[PDB]
Each structure stands twice: as structure tokens, then as C-alpha cells.
Amino acid sequence: GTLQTILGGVNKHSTSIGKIWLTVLFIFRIMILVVAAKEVWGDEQADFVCNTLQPGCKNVCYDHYFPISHIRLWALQLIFVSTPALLVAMHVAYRRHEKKEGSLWWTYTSSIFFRVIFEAAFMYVFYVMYDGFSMQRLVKCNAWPCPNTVDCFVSRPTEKTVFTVFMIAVSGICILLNVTELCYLLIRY
Amino acid sequence: GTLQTILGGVNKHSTSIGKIWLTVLFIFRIMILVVAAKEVWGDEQADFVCNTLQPGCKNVCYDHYFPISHIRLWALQLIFVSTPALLVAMHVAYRRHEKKEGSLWWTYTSSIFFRVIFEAAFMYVFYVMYDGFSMQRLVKCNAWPCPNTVDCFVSRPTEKTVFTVFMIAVSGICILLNVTELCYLLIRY
Amino acid sequence: GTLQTILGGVNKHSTSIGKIWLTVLFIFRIMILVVAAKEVWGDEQADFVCNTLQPGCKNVCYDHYFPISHIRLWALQLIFVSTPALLVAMHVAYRRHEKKEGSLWWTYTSSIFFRVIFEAAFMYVFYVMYDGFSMQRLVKCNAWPCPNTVDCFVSRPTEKTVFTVFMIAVSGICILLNVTELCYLLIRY
């Protein structure tokens, strides 16, 4: 509800690319995460099935191959890339209150520099942690107390792959948009 | 709550067909998806039953025949066909802010051109992926590790067929309405 | 929340019967569906029990006797009978905006004509599909793959019957109120 009012405040005090394309893509990712993707991961552990009679083997194998869920990583990423925009708004509101270019410049050019770092950091984590963007149907697990190697089966691997590729692609576009914003301000000096 | 306020803003700045019929049908599809259809697909995997003792065969057979759920496809389709309208609103708000036909024409005629493409694209995906709009009671699955061929049974196939035909028919009507909007602007030049 | 504001807008621009009795009964049906009836049908398939060892027989028997749930039919009916009122509101708002009897007459008399058709259509569907308004405790099912004939037992048949009779009776009253509205406008010509 009030989030729409927040967007209008953040909509102002930005450049053409920043006003429209960055904000639309940011809302785009939130909608995908909230209304569509969150129920795909609902039964991630409930429907995780292992071919064994060993008690506790299912708990350790799921924890080994999914140290942190994909949706939790995306939730953290959206929070981190949204804070520098929120910090600017409070700084401007604080600045206006005390009133009744250089300071504005350095705050703005720093905020879009942190967003690029955060986007690239989480994008790198997704790759190393899950060795690619495709989820497998079968995982082989040999952690204690599983005897030898145990076959375990993931829930909805194909649908999770579709949303993973979707979220990564949009994040890559947001990186390019922020990079161009730097170039526009770089040549203007 | 605030979504109603959003509709009023989008209600304005449109033509007779665009103001009323496109917006009503768009709200029509959202209501069907939210209040009625979403709980039909709630137990899609929980009540998926296969006649086998092989561990993991249920996971791979459901994933094979339902790579992405119908409700997730409709959620993606509604988001895509709604973005060009949202892009116009921010462009107009940006245009009005800087103020204090050709630009308006090209943005408007392009937005309704993207909606036709997105509607047809998702409509085509529904056909090829699910080979028609009727869901079967029985699916035969022979993917590893299922031994030979295994019979599996879908949950609520008839009710899902009813809502599938309903959503496809409304999407087809929206395509025709957008096509006529092009014709009205085509003859006017 | 905002739905209350919507009602006030729809409350105006109507006749004495239309202003009060039709709108109150419409809110009456929504309240019954939302706060009371929706949790009666919550375990419709989970608590559906069949006396058999055949895998998949439960899925096909429930689908055979309940092609579409009662609550989904009522949700569709309320949406259909509410659209003509919503179409009038946008037409009036569009008409007022362009400003700054015959047109108003034909739109109004048509809207209450569609409501009668939609109410009677869904009322007819409830009868033919479920052969009466009483739900049985026992259903006998012989669809493949059930061997011979299998006894299956419905969940909460009596409570569902009570709400079915309640919703049908209110719909019948709404039909009569709309018919009288036609008679008042018929004699006035």
C-alpha cells in the first residue's frame, strides 16, 4: 500500500535512466520474487527425497547442497541494492530540513557505485555456490551419517531453473544500466 | 488497496477501447488468477500419484510433464503485458515534470504493439508445452529412475481444463481489441 | 479497505431498489462466500475417502463427481454479475470527463438485463452438474482405473448442503428484484 507512495518519492530526484528504467526493473524483480517465485520453493525440503533408510541422512544432504535457498539470496540482494537509494532520500530530507552540488554529486555517484558492487557480488555468489544456473534432478551425497553414497532427488528442478535464469538476466541488465549512468556522468565531469 | 488508485491513473490517457475494454479485461484476468484459480493448483505435486515403489520416480515424472506450472505462466504473462502501460505512465510523468504529439504517438503505438507480441508469445507457449488446452487424467512416464513405464495420475484435471480454456479465451479477446486499436490509428494516420 | 469506497461510488447512480436491496444482497453473498463458506470446502479432496487399494482411483473419482468446486462456481458468478455495474461506472466517468438520457437509458436497461441472464445461467449449471442442491454422503464410482464399482465418501456433505441452499435462495431473490426493476422501467417507457 504505502510502498507505492515510497516509489513516488524515490521516482523523483533521479536522471532519465535512473528515474524510469532502474526503478521499473527493480519493481520487476520484486514482483517476480513475491507473486511467482516464492511458492515454487515452498516444498524445497518437504519434497526432497533420498533413497535410504538411514535416519538423518535427508537432513544433512539437503543442508550440504543448499546452504542457503535461492529465494533467500534474492531477498538479501534486493535489500542491499535498495539501501543506498534509501540513504540518499534521508540525506536529502535531512538536508532540506536544515536548510529551513558537490555534496549532492558525491552522494549520488557513490550510491550507484555501491549498487554495481552489490549486484556483481551476489551474482558471483550464485555461480560459485551452485556451480552454474541449472538445477539438477539428482544429487549424490556421501556426508555422514549417510552410508557410502546416497541418491537424492530435488523438487521442481526445471521450474527453479527457469526463474533462476530470469532473475540473473534482469540483474545483468541492471548492471549495464548503472554502468551507462556512470559514463554519462563521467564525460560530463 | 492502492492498486485501485493505480487503475484510475492508467484509466486516463487512453482511447475509448483502451480506456474501458482493455482495462476491464485486464482486471478480469487478475481476479480469476487471484481469487479462483490459484487454489486449484495448490496441491499439484502433493496429490500427484504414481503407481510404483521406486524412490524418486514421482519427482522426475512431475517435473517432466509440468516444467512450469500454468499459474506461474499466467503470472508472468500478466506482468509482461502490463509493463508497457507502466512505462508510458512514467514517461508522461517525466514529460510533464520537465515541462514545468509525435513523441506521444510513437510511445503509444509501440506499447500496444508489444502487448500483441507478448500475448501471442505466451499463447503459443501454452500450446507447444502442453500439447493442447485439455489436461489428461493419466500420464505415462519412462524417465530415469522409473522402471519401464509408470502410470501417474494428475490432480483435478477437469477443473484445471476449465480455467485454462477460460484464460485462453480472454487472452484471445484482448488480442483482437488491440488489433482493432491499431486499425483505428492506422486509417487516421 | 478500498472496496468500501468502491461501494459508495456504485451506491449512487441507481434507483431505489437498485441503490439498496441489490447492493446489500450482493455484499451479503460476498460475505457468506469469504468469511464462512470458503473454509468449508478447504479439505474437499484431502478428506475424500475411497474404499480401495487401487492407486489413482481416488484422483479420478473426485474429478468425475466434482468437475468444478462449488466455491469456484460462486466466485465466477459474482465476478460476472458485477462486471456490468463496473462497465457503467467507467462509461459514466468517461462521459463526464468528455463533457468538461437515451445513452444513459440504454446502458442501464442493458446492464440489468445481463445480470438476469448471468444469474439464471449459473443457477441452471448448479442444477444439471450436481443433479439437485443436496450433496450425498456416498458416491459410487466406476471410472478407470477403479476396479468394478468403488464406494467413496464426501467430506462435510451436510454443511455444504446448508450453504448451497443459502446461496441459491439469495440468487433467486436477486433475480426477482432485477425483474421488478425492469417492470418499473417498462411501464414508465
Added chain:
Amino acid sequence: GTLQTILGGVNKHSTSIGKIWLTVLFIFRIMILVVAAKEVWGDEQADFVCNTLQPGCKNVCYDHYFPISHIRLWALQLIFVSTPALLVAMHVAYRRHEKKEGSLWWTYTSSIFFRVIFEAAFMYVFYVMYDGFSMQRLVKCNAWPCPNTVDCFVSRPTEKTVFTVFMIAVSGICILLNVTELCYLLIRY
């Protein structure tokens, strides 16, 4: 949210007893039903246990002894006793709109007459249907297909009894308050 605004409108246009005590007790019953009582009846059928191996005996015994749940009866009762107050508000709003004692008297004295009837009707139903206000731990069921007589056990019988006595007592107080309101208007003539 907006319900609080609704109360303020209904708070006005009433007498001293009607303004305060009837409205407070009405909010009192809603709070008990919503925040406290509704989760007591959550597992009414899930935790209903019968001592038998007969398939379907649990479904028919629960349906026999609980034709309609207590919380659904209270939800219906609150809706019925609230409509005459809502009808008056629309009548007054309609009356004021056309402007820009006898009519007001008959509408008001009729509304509080319907509330007494509805309160007594539902109170009578609670008694005959459930033969008293105390819920038993054990119910004996001999309906088909249960063999002979089967023992079944109710979930949370004591807590449900506490809330049943609570709701009945408050309803009895509301009857007395409405009766006195008639007496005050009866002597005044």
C-alpha cells in the same frame, strides 16, 4: 482498517443505549470470534478420532454430529443482526441525497425488532441442534457404514464449551438491551 470508519458512521444516528452498549457488545462478539475462537475450531475434523477400521465411518460420524460448525453459525448470526443497521444507513444516505419523523420512526423501530428475532432464532438453533451448550468428549455413532456402534472422540471439547457459553451469554445481554430500547420508545409513543 476502514471498518473503524464504518463504526463511526453507525455510531451516530442512535439512542444512548443504541449508540454505546449495543455497538460495544457487537464489536465485543466480533473480536472473540476473530482473534480467539476461530483457531479453536481449526482442527475440528482433522483431530476427530474414531475407534474403527471401517473406511468412511469417520466422515459420516463427524457430519452426523456437526451438521454445521459453531463458528459458521456465529458468523451467520453476526451478518444477519448487522444488516438492519446497514439498511438504515443507506436509507438515511438516500434520504439526505434526495433532500438536496414518521419515516425515520418506522424504519428505526422495525430494525431493532428484526434484531431481536434474529438473535432469538439463532439462539434457539444452537440449543436444539446441539442439545445444550456443553460439548461431550465421546459421541456414539451408528450411521452407515459404521459397523454397530462406534466410539468417536471430539477435539478440544472443554475449550469449545467455554467459548460457547461466552457467546450465548453476550447474545442474551444484547436481547435484553434491545428489549429495553423498545420499552423506552413504547412509553414515549
Added chain:
Amino acid sequence: GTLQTILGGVNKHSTSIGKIWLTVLFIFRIMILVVAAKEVWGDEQADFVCNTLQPGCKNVCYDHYFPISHIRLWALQLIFVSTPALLVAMHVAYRRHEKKEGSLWWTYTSSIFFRVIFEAAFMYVFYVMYDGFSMQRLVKCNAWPCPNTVDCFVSRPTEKTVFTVFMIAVSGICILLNVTELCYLLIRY
């Protein structure tokens, strides 16, 4: 949402202790009950485990030792201690409306007298019903149909004890604050 607006209205028309400390502690208890304590009691019966093969013994033993849940008692207590404040607000609003010390005194001094009674009554009930504020891991049950004496095990006894002590301590503080409010008005006469 609107509850915050309600607090502002109740915040005014009170004394220094009443304006701040009573209202803060009242909000304090609601937050504990809503956001923290309510999910502790979620599986109170689902995870209640008894060492027996007797059908129905689990139902009767849980009902015997938990006639009413702790969270339901706290929900009732908060509603009761909040009504006298709500009654004053409607009385003042009614008084102001008819306008366009003694009456105000007696209403105010009575309201804080009922709050002390309600706080002490529920505090006494918690003690006698549950014989102290510590919940045990093991309960021994011999009610029919349990054979002899059966061992049953409570879910999350330690966490429930922590929140029980927390709620009792805050209630005790609220009693003292109300008592001092009487003393301040007693000496002033």
C-alpha cells in the same frame, strides 16, 4: 493500520501515568502475543505425544490438562481490560456531540477500577488452572479411555514457560500502575 490512529485518540484524555506508561505496556503485551508468542503454541496438540496404543487417549489427555490454551486466555484478558477505555471514548464522543467534572470523574475512576479487577481475575485463573507458571515436560493421565496411567509429553515446555513468566510480570506491573493512579486521585479527592 488504523489501530495506530485509535491509539492517538486513546493517548489523549488521560493522566501522566495513564497517557504513557499504561498505554505503552498495553501495546507491549499485544506485540508479544501477536508477533512472538502465537507461533509458539501453534503445534500444541499436533506435537502432543502419548505412550499408548489406545485410540482417543491423546484427545482426552490434552483436553484434561489444557482446558483452555494460554494464548486464548491472554487474548481474552487483553479484550476485557481494553473495553473500559473504549467505553470512555464513546461516552466522551457522545457527550461532545450533545454539547453542540463529576460525570467525567465517576466514569474515569470506575474504568481504572474495572481494569484492576480484570487483571487480578485472569492472573488468579492462570495460577489455579495451571498450578503455577512453570510447564512440565511430562504429564500423567488416567482419564477414560486411557488404560491405567499413561505418560504424555508436552511440546516446547521451556519456551512456553519463558513467555508465561514474561506476560505475568508485565500484568503485575500494570496492576501497580493502576493502583498508584487511584492513590493520586484519592489524595486529591
Added chain:
Amino acid sequence: GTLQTILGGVNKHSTSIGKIWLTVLFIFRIMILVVAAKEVWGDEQADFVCNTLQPGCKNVCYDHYFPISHIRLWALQLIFVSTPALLVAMHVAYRRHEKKEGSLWWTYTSSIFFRVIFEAAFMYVFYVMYDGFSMQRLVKCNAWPCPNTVDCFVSRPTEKTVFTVFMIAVSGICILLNVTELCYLLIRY
């Protein structure tokens, strides 16, 4: 919704560090707890698995090693560290109402002194209760009625460790920010 309005009121009447960094980190912790961390702990007891046939051993072992859940501790911590800010707001509103440095100084310097105490207290509790910030896959339990020593396995130990380190680190930063706020006011005297 209204929480955003609350933040704006709390945003004012603070110092540079207090206005921005403390409030942003406070919102930061709430977002992590609400949208991300709360569903990690959803199946804490449901997926807790012990290698035994002893009834009731699972209940006592979970209760022994998790006397209070991590998310409940964080919920309590956020409530405690937020009350002194809320107390100041009501004091200022009360002060302004009666109007129509020393008092303001002592209230402000005390509020940030309580926040440091509460942050350190809960941080200490997390350490002693859970002997570090890393959660183990395996816990060995010998409480009655478990025979000898029983192996039990925790659900999602790695993901819970990640969020535990995250919440502790942010709390440590908030302690440092409050300490510096004291130093700024200490030198100014």
C-alpha cells in the same frame, strides 16, 4: 502501511547519526527477520529427526537444545530496543500538548543508554545459550526418557548459521553507533 508514517515521525527529532544510520540499520534488521529469516525456522521441530523408537524422546531433546527459538529472541530484542524511542515520542507529544533543554537532554541521553544495555544483554544471551554462533548438524541427547544417548539431527543448520552471523554483526554495528553518539554528547557536555 502506517509503519512508514511512524518512521517519518521518529526520523525527525534526532541527531545526524541517530536520524539516518541507526534508523536505517533498525529497518534493515526488521526486513531480514520478516521477509527472509522467518521461513528458515518454519520447520525447526517438524524436520527435527532423532534415531530412536522411544516415544517422547524427540519432544524432550528439541526442548533441551532449543529452549527459545532464535527468531523469537530477535523479535524480543527488536521490541525492547524500540521502546525507548517510542517513549520519547509520547513524552514530546505530551510536552507539546501541555505547552499549548534539560528535560529533553536527560530523556534523550537515557534512551540511547538503555539501547546499548538491551543490545549487549541479548547479544550475551545468544552466546551463552547456544555456545557460539554456529549451529551443529548433530546433537547428542541423554535426557529422560531417551535411552542412553540418542543422535538427533537439526534442520537447515548452515542457513541458520548464515542469518545468525548476519544479525549479530548488524547488532554489533548498532552498538558502536550508539557509543559514538554518547561520545559526541559527552565532549559537548
